[PDB]
Chains A and B, each alone.
Chain A
């Protein structure tokens, strides 16, 4: 089982520095080559660089030449992306990925076939803020047929991302988590709602587990129906 495990994402000053990390396994690192690809939110994918770790050879997308360095630690099977002079336009999710073969020898790759899940890099001089979690209480509508809606949002936080689950991820069916929205104050806000039978409302506990790592905020909110 293959696995590429990204890290080092985060929030940095304009002009600042950052090192991403991609720890790989279960394919022959030395006879592969490692890629970084990036996606600024809501736009398409942009290839950034690759390296052939055995050879030490590399290429860089123009948009990034001069400022980012790719490298690999063969003893640990880990590729790095060193990011200098970061600008705001650098803000994106950053994937690592692999192809069979080497810089100048791509003919035989079966494309970039394994991909990390990406860390997010935010370049901004805005401060970190943790979210507040408020309940979205069910009542009559939240109630349509004999099923009702309840949620929490998740207000006023920066930078992304936030993770939300329900009753530690036990409850998953009929759950909707909305993409976050950037408010005019420059903070994010997001909501997450789940629909459930009216009959389960006196009798079943609903808790949303909100985590916001960049600010060290961990919250569990028990959404009860209101008086």
Chain B
């Protein structure tokens, strides 16, 4: 590369309805050869704006792009649930190194707090047959993203043998979902009675447990 594209902030969150502003500063003049792309996760980016400020066909007109000097700004005029994504700028002015991107900006939707509902799944017979055991704890449709999920086996807090992963923010209702998975060897699993996940989240007025005893 020879022309750099610095993009800020690298994330933000805003309420349905707020005006929102991403800025991209070119390392040197780039006249108007600037594009903006939206990328909703696990999909390919979608052109939003080309030529610094021209709106791409079929893109909703709450989006718009402008330029002064070497700063460009994508601006969503009144934010929407389905606008959850990562946005990138791109210059195509350079003779040798056209089409290079900024580092992108993650945009999250702020919504009213929502407690998760919490479910627990014991390991399957078939998996045990094979000699390991997985306990799954699922937190469903909550907001905000921050949660603590703790695995407890017979009162021992488990660490470094569970693993979690989180969905992308729903664009119908702006909530998340989280699955944690505790894994032990067939041997260990059978060494203990009570299996519990312990969810703390802003939306629950106190922490929540879901547990079970081996065999029941």
Contact = CB atoms under 8 A, between A and B. Distances in A.
Q: Do chains A and B touch in the complex (CB under 8 A)?
A: yes
Interface of A: 35, 37, 44-47, 50, 59, 61-62, 95, 97, 99, 104, 106-107, 109-113, 115-118, 132, 134-137, 141-145, 148-149, 151, 153, 155, 176-181, 183, 189-191, 193, 195
Interface string B13-44: 00000000000000000000101010100111
Contacts of A62: 1
Given A45-B45, A112-B47, A35 B165 contact: no
A149 B45 CA distance: 32
A118 B136 contact: no
Contacts of B92: 99, 106, 109, 111
A59 B95 CA distance: 10
Contact of B136 (A132, A153, A177, A180): A153
Interface string B191-202: 000000000000
B181 A191 contact: yes
B98 interface: yes
A44 B50 contact: no
B136 A47 contact: no
Contact of A59 (B42, B97, B122, B179): B97
Interface in B169-216: 177, 179, 181, 210
A95 B35 CA distance: 17
Contacts of A176: 140, 167, 177
25 contacts: A37-B99, A44-B88, A44-B102, A45-B39, A45-B88, A45-B104, A62-B1, A107-B33, A110-B50, A111-B49, A132-B127, A134-B126, A136-B124, A137-B121, A141-B119, A142-B120, A143-B119, A151-B138, A153-B181, A179-B167, A179-B168, A190-B165, A191-B136, A191-B181, A195-B140
Nearest to A195: B140
B174 to A, nearest CB: 14
A152 B65 CA distance: 44
A178 B44 CA distance: 18
Contact of B181 (A104, A113, A189): A189
Interface string B115-145: 0011111111011001000101010100000
B44 to A, nearest CB: 4
A177 B178 CA distance: 10
Contacts of B54: 110
A111 B54 CA distance: 10
B12 interface: no
B111 to A, nearest CB: 18
How many B residues are at the interface, by size bracket? 35 or more
B56 to A, nearest CB: 7
Contacts of A109: 50, 92
Contacts of A134: 123-124, 126-127, 134
B101 interface: yes
Contact of B166 (A47, A117, A137, A179): A179
Contacts of B90: 47, 111-112
Nearest to B90: A111
B44 A117 contact: yes
A193 B93 CA distance: 46
B167 A178 contact: yes
A69 B19 CA distance: 43
A112 B120 contact: no
B138 A110 contact: no
B4 interface: no
Given A44-B101, A59-B98, A191 B44 contact: no
Contacts of B167: 176-179
Contact of A113 (B42, B56, B93): B56
B86 interface: yes
A223 to B, nearest CB: 10
A137 B168 CA distance: 24
B121 A181 contact: no
Contact of A132 (B35, B44, B93, B130): B130
A46 B118 CA distance: 39
